[PDB]
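Why this split exists: single-chain examples teach little about how molecules sit against one another. For that reason, every record in the complexes split bundles all components of an assembly together and asks for one structure covering all of them. Below is a record exactly as it appears in the raw files.
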Amino acid sequence: AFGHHVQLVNREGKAVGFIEIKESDDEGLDIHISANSLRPGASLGFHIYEKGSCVRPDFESAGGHFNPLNKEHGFNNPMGHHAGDLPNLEVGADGKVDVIMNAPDTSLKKGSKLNILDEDGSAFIIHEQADDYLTNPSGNSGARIVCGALLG
Amino acid sequence: AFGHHVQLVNREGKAVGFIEIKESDDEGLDIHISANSLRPGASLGFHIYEKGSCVRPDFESAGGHFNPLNKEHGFNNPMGHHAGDLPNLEVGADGKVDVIMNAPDTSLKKGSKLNILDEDGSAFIIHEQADDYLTNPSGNSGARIVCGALLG
Amino acid sequence: AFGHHVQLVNREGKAVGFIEIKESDDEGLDIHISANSLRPGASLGFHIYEKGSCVRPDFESAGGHFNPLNKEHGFNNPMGHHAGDLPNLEVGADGKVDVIMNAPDTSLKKGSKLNILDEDGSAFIIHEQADDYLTNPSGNSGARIVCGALLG
Amino acid sequence: AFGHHVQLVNREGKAVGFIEIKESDDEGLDIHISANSLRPGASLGFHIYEKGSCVRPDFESAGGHFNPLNKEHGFNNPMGHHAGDLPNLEVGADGKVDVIMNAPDTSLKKGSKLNILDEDGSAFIIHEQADDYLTNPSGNSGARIVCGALLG
Ligand SMILES: [Cu+2]
Ligand SMILES: [Cu+2]
Ligand SMILES: [Cu+2]
Ligand SMILES: [Cu+2]
Ligand SMILES: [Zn+2]
Ligand SMILES: [Zn+2]
Ligand SMILES: [Zn+2]
Ligand SMILES: [Zn+2]
Ligand SMILES: [Zn+2]
Ligand SMILES: [Zn+2]
Ligand SMILES: [Zn+2]
Ligand SMILES: [Zn+2]
Ligand SMILES: [Zn+2]
Ligand SMILES: [Zn+2]
């Protein structure tokens, strides 16, 4: 079943949705994301970050696209991509995204290099603009505008 | 000799000093930093960022402490220190600073993994408060307040 | 309406955009500046000069930051500032700028001492680096690199 | 007694003579100027500038015909004349000039609004061309080709 429930908040502190995760067969992780209050009909950057910490308004604090394999950013970079690089969100007329994405190169298993429930935890962040799938170190996705932490 | 001159600007895009660089002997790089308009008497964090970009007001734009070898932040971190972690700057009653720091784990020579003059460039950033040499991603140094871009 | 169209050239005489001006409510002058071929990512200084003449290559040729009340240079100078001093321009990764700056101490009205549309005209200039908002004659902005003449 | 000795250099850094100054009787200042390496037979622009600073090649850097009384440039302009406006140099077959000029509207006195030995200092500059005694801001004299600074 889906578990590991994570509340999403915006820069102003508003609850705007949740994520749940499932230990996918197979393999990697299925991510149920169900959010509101987004730019209606935008393409938006979406990634797993390396530190479970969402301090507003900016969320720099903390990190880092999740990158246990030390690669460059981008599905279409020949030197890419990071393990927490996911495909863009496609927001409805509503301002909602309600989908399930696969994250092949992640895990919940302690010990494993692909673990996102490590000591640090990890963060899911929505960006202001699209990931261009190519530029270092975050696809030119702009400001981090929603955040949720999974605690480690 | 020192060269590769970088201008420093604050969050208002005012000129606040400069930086020059020497291919050290020995080793890494020597970084001459001569800055004004700063908090009088402050210790302020100081690091090389992974992209040669300085967009006001808050400089997230862009990146990233420069991290070729994928470690954590901090001189006092066992898992640590990013190749762009430099020691804290000490500001006089003056508002000013004028030192030469050594950055041993950097290079200017094209194609070295430690190369800070890559296609991307690098940025020198001064923070609003002192680094603790330990916490991820930036040592709780706070806001980015001065940025100078090394381009190409 | 914005009117009084001015073409901008570089040190080579190449066209690099334009300028338009609105009698601002309120008040003073609104200044629409749209430019290209500039150093990507740079803060560049930007000032209204006192004569409407742009002779290649260095634009000396004339003058003069526009200084009808005979002050010193600098937003940050207690003995400032010239009527022609404006805030620095920020250039995109693009090499471009496209902004409206407000110039509160200028006028288009014949006879007003703050008149930029006088019998010898005024020039709009971009410099090679950022104004410190302090030093005389021009805030250590470096060479004049782009000029357009407003000829009243 | 002449004193306050200043070394004259050209745009290329060659020593090309000197100026000395006497607290005139009366009034203002007598200026002994003795220069070489100049265009033989030319009538040339010669002025006291408001900042003691001679940066080569161009001497823009710094300022300003010296102007404590907020006047326009030119003996023959009726809105006329800068305190540092002087008569044109008349170069001999030599390429040499060796004269004493009177500057009636200046002074060495530290309490004086006419003081040229102020905090800032003044520059004496020779122009590439003749001053037309009429036009703003420097009488159509062209490039600044020789500069000597009096420090403040
Ligand atoms: Cu991202
Ligand atoms: Cu930092
Ligand atoms: Cu200027
Ligand atoms: Cu002159
Ligand atoms: Zn990434
Ligand atoms: Zn982690
Ligand atoms: Zn670091
Ligand atoms: Zn120094
Ligand atoms: Zn880089
Ligand atoms: Zn100015
Ligand atoms: Zn525009
Ligand atoms: Zn004018
Ligand atoms: Zn004059
Ligand atoms: Zn002075």
